[PDB]
Nucleic acid binder design. Structure first.
Ligand SMILES: [Mg+2]
Ligand SMILES: [Mg+2]
Ligand SMILES: [Mg+2]
Ligand SMILES: [Mg+2]
Ligand SMILES: [Mg+2]
Ligand SMILES: [Mg+2]
Ligand SMILES: [Mg+2]
Ligand SMILES: [Mg+2]
Ligand SMILES: [Mg+2]
Ligand SMILES: [Mg+2]
Ligand SMILES: [Mg+2]
Ligand SMILES: [Mg+2]
Ligand SMILES: [Mg+2]
Ligand SMILES: [Mg+2]
Lengths: 169, 58, 159, 291, 205
RNA sequence: GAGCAGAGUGGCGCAGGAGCGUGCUGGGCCCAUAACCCAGAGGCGAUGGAUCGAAACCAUCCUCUGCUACCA
RNA sequence: AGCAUG
RNA sequence: CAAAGUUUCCCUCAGGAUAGCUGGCGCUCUCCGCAGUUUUAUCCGGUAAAGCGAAUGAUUAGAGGUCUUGGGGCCGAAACGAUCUCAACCUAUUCUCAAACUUUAAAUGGGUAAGAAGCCCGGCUCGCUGGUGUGGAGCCGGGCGUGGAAUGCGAGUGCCUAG
RNA sequence: CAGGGAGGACAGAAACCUCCCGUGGAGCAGAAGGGCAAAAGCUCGCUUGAUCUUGAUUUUCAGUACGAAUACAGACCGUGAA
RNA sequence: GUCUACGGCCAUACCACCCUGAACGCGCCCGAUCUCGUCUGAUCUCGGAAGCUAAGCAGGGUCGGGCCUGGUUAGUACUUGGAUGGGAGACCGCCUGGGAAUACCGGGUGCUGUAGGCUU
């Protein structure tokens, strides 16, 4: 088997959408900063929804992306929290999957009352060597048709690497 | 008291009664409207042309 | 009364041909234009600078002044009962060379060549162009098979 | 379902970019702004210094644009530096400087202005620009073609530019993107540029890495160890390379070789061939259907 | 209370459709163009009959609806309730304008939309009937009765094609047997020899 | 026909970041009803568009109300 | 100071 | 000899100025040049026509699909488990259109050229441009007449000027 | 870019995150038309060529003027490695 | 035969899927000390050479979609000039010249300039 077809985690994307701006949003940013080990960035609201209580250009969410050994260890913590239990539909047809967590203390981080309780949103994107030509500058190209990752391949990789279980539905 | 507004009825005959004459042409044309820098150099060249006369004649 | 706008009625005149929008090819900029050349005017909508007036579009002029990005060209314009030869400034994009003069240049070069030839030899050579001469007498061979008979078909209403 | 976007109408109204843009090779905005000669210059050539950094070498060319295609008057590659002594490191700042200098000297030797306009024999790192001397033929002038590369501070295209400037071409530039310009303070020191030209940053890396961990040192430098070049030899060997390039800048072509004319690809199939292929497929399918 | 059709029976003005410039147009009187048994396969209605126009003029939606009603009534009476098929092949898109008086005169005399008419050319089909081969005289008589509701001259002509298709009746069975034609309801689909042969083998298996 | 004004809680009305007096419902005082007192519920004529956001802005319509349609 | 009715 | 009710401006529309159409007086040449014409080359265009199995905007009709949603339901607590379905949706087709739509695209037509003011050599000037008496332009000297499509015809130019 | 598809705790028809398709189906102050995709759009950094001056030309046209525009030339500047 | 650097004409070069790639090369690929830039060395910049044709890329293929060029549609539609032609008209025919476009049916699927390589 060719070595350059091995699946790998390009990056793990974490975000918390608190839905408003100010001290709670800063607290959530501190949550995921202490979780990962890098300063996050704030996302703004693009429209204005009176029922949701968000206005245009209002900072309502915070997100970060982790790559490498830190990504794999944080994903391991998240899947340990979710006891390696994913549905069949949790996997995107393009080769990715993700899940959420309703309480972030379960990850194994100390609670400090000046921060509180927040829920996370995990989303990993699987890779394959040579994917960087799609986003490189000088001679950009596609990534081929055989070289692409499918839902079945992502599921099989998950269940053989994290020796997990996939429940239908 | 309305009257006619616009017309070009008899105009072609009025024009070809004396004929449609093409613009008059001459061998040499005026040097107006051309680049001032290029004119300045041309004038300098004409002014100093005199000093190669002996070599030209020889 | 219509308006006196500078681009009135140019909707299709200054529009790009089908599947030919976008970046301008570089050979047009890379052409060189001496003074006295004959030039065909054609406006191109991609570039809005140095655009000729719509009355000169489709006309042919003569270069008299070459500049950084444009050329001064003398064109003939007919107004009422007189023709004025007036000077305009047109950018290089709206300009192409004319092959009408190139044909005559090739012919004159060949004419001088054919004059210097067949002159030491003493023979006479035609140089002028004569109009399409009437067909000379010729035979038509019906070798075997005979011309088939053609008669009009009966009418019927196809549709 | 979902409405298909790429259908017959889409394909028959599609309009493709230029071939070079499709392959990603060129940037036509800068191309037009950089290669076009002014009209009253009347086909006077306008020159470019192309600097392209590849994964394994550096390409430097001097060219001017013509309608039939770009005409290249001189070319100097980094892979011919082993002739002059540089064995390894053919894609660093020092190699970029050396190949630029080689291109400049080769062009000067071609044009016969190589004795005049010696440039910087002893590199000092700071700004220099050749000044055309009166009486003698004027200095050669060209411009930098950076391509699609990000022209940020400390770039090998600017290293090649400095090499060519020391060689003796009059390329307009500023000492703001040379490695050594400190943005937060807005001055430029030349000794750091000299270190980058001579490979002292690479040498310091080797010292540091072999001091910390020999496994990582060997992994990061294996052909270096093979060509037994140490951190204490790089300044001397790069100076020798500069001197050799300034000595013998001419290029001698590799001799042409006989060909046995062996095709490695597949020729295009013919009309009757594919028609009878379709006929065979139909016959076989009908035979199986009957069977 | 509309003007006699002789006021609007000639193709005098440029084609003038209901668009974002012409608004406020009342809807046409004819809203159904296909009727009879239109769920019938192409196999069972071979005979076709047309009402070919003989003048370049305009036909009103009211006239089109009246002729449609007359033809349907006679066909129902004669060929049974669902033994035929009628297709009106004219759609009124040209809208006519009326300058309503009562005293401004001809000052600002541009009319408002009144109704819609259809511009027709020489040899352009107005109506078509698709039915059994035995009902030829019934079709001819139905078209003859529908003729009187239209101004100008028209003529009844029996088409050489098969049903409401563009393929000749004599060769229709040959071609459908030889598998160039795939029936697809009212009409038929012509199968060329230029696609991928996967479709060819799918048809042949 | 042209100009013009006006459509909003059951009825009459106010009005760029849905309400009034009256009506209605529940409970109080009274032998009981109204009056009086305490609470509550109830909805921008239609369409499209400018706008971060409109019942309010801009056009077209569905009604209704008023003013002119003179001179011989 | 307001206080109608059966 | 011989017209005009046309262009632009004016508190102008029953009037003026202005250009156009006209006449008169001449003068510079003649006894190459010009043309309400064609031919040969070369460009220009978006009308007629045509098209909607191509974009935009209208538009009739049946077909094949699917779970993508909603419903009539029924079997079932139920269940994307399932039945007919009506539907929208997707896919090939089909009928009819567009002064303010278009991939196409005429006929008639609008510029330019058909040489002596043209070519081919030699040299000088330049403060412009310049890797390079490089590029371009201007100047002096010389050499080549089969006046390089058809047809027709004497041309040019200046004042004054009425209606 | 408009939009569409498949996923992710609250989160939903609509909040934010990720991948894929996406010839412009978006946007470029305003009416319409034309033009535009490593841009003419979106986001950043620096700035004031929206500055001083003589001529030539185009548009309406009488080949008058205003307005608007084009190609230069001479200063002094901005920006970019150029 | 074939590639790389810069290009010209900008689909005969595009798009979808499949097969093959000797050597060079182009690549993917290994790390952040230095220059440089990010929430993230993923992009960009930099220092390399353990591995690989899996991907880009090149050549070929599909009774492929598209594109290009032909035939048919068709001397049909339309149209210059003409008649004391027809017809109540709407319109039509003839004379004199020019002359298209879908559906349908074939064929083809990048040429090429400058400089530098590989094919001992
Ligand atoms: Mg008048
Ligand atoms: Mg750039
Ligand atoms: Mg009319
Ligand atoms: Mg006044
Ligand atoms: Mg009078
Ligand atoms: Mg038009
Ligand atoms: Mg038409
Ligand atoms: Mg840009
Ligand atoms: Mg990396
Ligand atoms: Mg590969
Ligand atoms: Mg492969
Ligand atoms: Mg094909
Ligand atoms: Mg080549
Ligand atoms: Mg061998």
């Amino acid at each position: 088997e060719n070595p350059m077809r091995e699946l790998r985690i390009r990056k793990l994307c974490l975000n918390i959408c608190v839905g408003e701006s100010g001290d709670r949003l800063t607290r959530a940013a501190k949550v995921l900063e202490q979780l990962t080990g890098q300063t996050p960035v704030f996302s703004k609201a693009r429209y204005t929804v009176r029922s949701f209580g968000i206005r245009r250009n209002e900072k309502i969410a915070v997100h970060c992306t982790v790559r490498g050994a830190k990504a794999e260890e944080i994903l391991e913590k998240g899947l340990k929290v979710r006891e390696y239990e994913l549905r069949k539909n949790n996997f995107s047809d393009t080769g990715n999957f993700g899940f959420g967590i309703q309480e972030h203390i379960d990850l194994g981080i100390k609670y400090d009352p000046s921060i509180g309780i927040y829920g996370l949103d995990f989303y990993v994107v699987l890779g394959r060597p040579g994917f960087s030509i799609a986003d490189k500058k000088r001679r950009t190209g596609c990534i081929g048709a055989k070289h692409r990752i499918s839902k079945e391949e992502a599921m099989r990789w998950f269940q053989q690497k994290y020796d997990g279980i996939i429940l239908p539905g | 008291a309305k009257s006619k507004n616009h017309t070009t009825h008899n105009q072609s005959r009025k024009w070809h009664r004396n004929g449609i004459k093409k613009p008059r042409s001459q061998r040499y044309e005026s040097l107006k409207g051309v680049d001032p820098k290029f004119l300045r150099n041309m004038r300098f060249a004409k002014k100093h042309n005199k000093k190669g006369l002996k070599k030209m004649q020889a | 009364t219509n308006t006196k706008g500078k681009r009135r009625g140019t909707r299709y005149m200054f529009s790009r041909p089908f599947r030919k929008h976008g970046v301008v090819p570089l050979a047009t900029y890379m052409r060189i234009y001496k003074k006295g050349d004959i030039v065909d005017i054609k406006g191109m909508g991609t570039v809005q600078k140095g655009m000729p007036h719509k009355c000169y579009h489709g006309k042919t002029g003569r270069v008299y002044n070459v500049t950084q990005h444009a050329v001064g060209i003398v064109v003939n314009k007919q107004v009422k009962g007189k023709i004025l030869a007036k000077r305009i400034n047109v950018r290089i994009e709206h300009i192409k060379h004319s092959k009408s003069r190139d044909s005559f240049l090739k012919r004159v070069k060949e004419n001088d060549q054919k004059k210097k030839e067949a002159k030491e030899k003493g023979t006479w050579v035609q140089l002028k162009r004569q109009p399409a001469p009437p067909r000379e007498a010729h035979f038509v061979r019906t070798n075997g098979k005979e011309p088939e008979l053609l008669e009009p078909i009966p009418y019927e209403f196809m549709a | 379902f979902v409405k298909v976007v790429k259908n017959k109408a889409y394909f028959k109204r599609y309009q493709v970019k230029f071939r070079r843009r499709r392959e990603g090779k060129t940037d036509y905005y800068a191309r037009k702004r950089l290669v076009i000669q002014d009209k009253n210059k009347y086909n006077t050539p306008k020159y470019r210094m192309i600097v392209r950094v590849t994964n394994r070498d550096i390409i430097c060319q001097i060219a001017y644009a013509r309608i039939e295609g770009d005409m290249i008057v001189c070319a100097a590659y980094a892979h011919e530096l082993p002739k002059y002594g540089v064995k390894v490191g053919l894609t660093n700042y020092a190699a970029a400087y050396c190949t630029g200098l080689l291109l400049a000297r080769r062009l000067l030797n071609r044009f016969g202005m190589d004795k005049i306009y010696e440039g910087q024999v002893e590199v000092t790192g700071d700004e220099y620009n050749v000044e055309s001397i009166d009486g003698q033929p004027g200095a050669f002038t060209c411009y930098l073609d950076a391509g699609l590369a990000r022209t940020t501070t400390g770039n090998k295209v600017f290293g090649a530019l400095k090499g060519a400037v020391d060689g003796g071409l009059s390329i307009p530039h500023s000492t703001k993107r040379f490695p050594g310009y400190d943005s937060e303070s807005k001055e430029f020191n030349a000794e750091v540029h000299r270190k980058h030209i001579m490979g002292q940053n690479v040498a310091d890396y080797m010292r540091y890495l072999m001091e910390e961990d020999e496994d990582a040192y060997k992994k990061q430098f294996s052909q270096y160890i093979k060509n037994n070049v140490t951190p204490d030899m790089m300044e001397e060997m790069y100076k020798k390379a500069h001197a050799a390039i300034r000595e013998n800048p001419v290029y001698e072509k590799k001799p042409k070789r006989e060909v046995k004319k062996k095709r490695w690809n597949r020729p295009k199939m013919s009309l009757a061939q594919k028609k009878d292929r379709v006929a065979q497929k139909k016959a076989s399918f009908l035979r199986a259907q009957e069977r | 209370g509309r003007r006699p059709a002789r006021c609007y029976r000639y193709c005098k003005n440029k084609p003038y459709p209901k668009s974002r410039f012409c608004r406020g147009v009342p809807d046409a009187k004819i809203r159904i163009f296909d009727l009879g048994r239109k769920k019938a396969k192409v196999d069972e209605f071979p005979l076709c009959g047309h009402m070919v126009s003989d003048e370049y003029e305009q036909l009103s939606s009211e006239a089109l609806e009246a002729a449609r009603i007359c033809a349907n009534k006679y066909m129902v009476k004669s060929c049974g309730k669902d033994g035929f098929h009628i297709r009106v092949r004219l759609h009124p898109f040209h809208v006519i304008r009326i300058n309503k008086m009562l005293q401004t005169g001809m000052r600002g005399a541009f009319g408002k939309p009144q109704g819609t008419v259809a511009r027709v050319h020489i040899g352009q089909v107005i109506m078509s009937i698709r039915t059994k081969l035995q009902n030829k005289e019934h079709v001819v008589e139905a078209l003859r009765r529908a003729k009187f509701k239209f101004p100008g001259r028209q003529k009844i002509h029996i088409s050489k094609k098969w049903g409401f298709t563009k393929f000749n009746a004599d060769e229709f069975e040959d071609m459908v047997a030889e598998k160039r034609l795939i029936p697809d309801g009212c009409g038929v689909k012509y199968i060329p020899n230029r696609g991928p042969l996967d479709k060819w083998r799918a048809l042949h298996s």
